[PDB]
Amino acid sequence: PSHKTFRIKQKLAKAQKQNRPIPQWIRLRTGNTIRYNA
């Protein structure tokens, strides 16, 4: 709801961060196998 707490606001922020896609320069590292975010 509109009423929340800073701590749960921070957790909601982290969930957004983990949804971010994969940077392109990761895919060019030697020995890399990561293609798409899971």
Partner RNA sequence: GAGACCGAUAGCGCACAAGUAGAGUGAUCGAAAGAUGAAAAGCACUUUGAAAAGAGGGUUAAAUAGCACGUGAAAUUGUUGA
Partner RNA sequence: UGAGCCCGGGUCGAACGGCCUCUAGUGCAGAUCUUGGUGGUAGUAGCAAAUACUUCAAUGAGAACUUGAAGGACCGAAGUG
Partner RNA sequence: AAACUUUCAACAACGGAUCUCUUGGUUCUGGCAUCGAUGAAGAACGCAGCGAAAUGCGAUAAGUAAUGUGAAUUGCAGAAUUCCGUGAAUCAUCGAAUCUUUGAACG
Residues touching other proteins: how many (CB under 8 A)?
8
The single residue listed with the structure tokens 């940077």 is 23
Contact map string, positions 1 to 38, toward RNA, x by CB under 7 A: ---------xx-xx--xxxx-xx-xx-xxx--xxxxxx
Q: In angstroms, what is the minimal distance from the CB of 16 to RNA? A: 9
Q: In angstroms, what is the minimal distance from the CB of 32 to other proteins? A: 12
The last residues before gaps in the chain (C-N over 2.5 Å) are none
Q: Please state, in angstroms and rounded to a whole number, the distance separating the CA atoms of residues 12 and 1.
A: 13
- Determine if 18 is a binding residue for other proteins (CB under 8 A): no
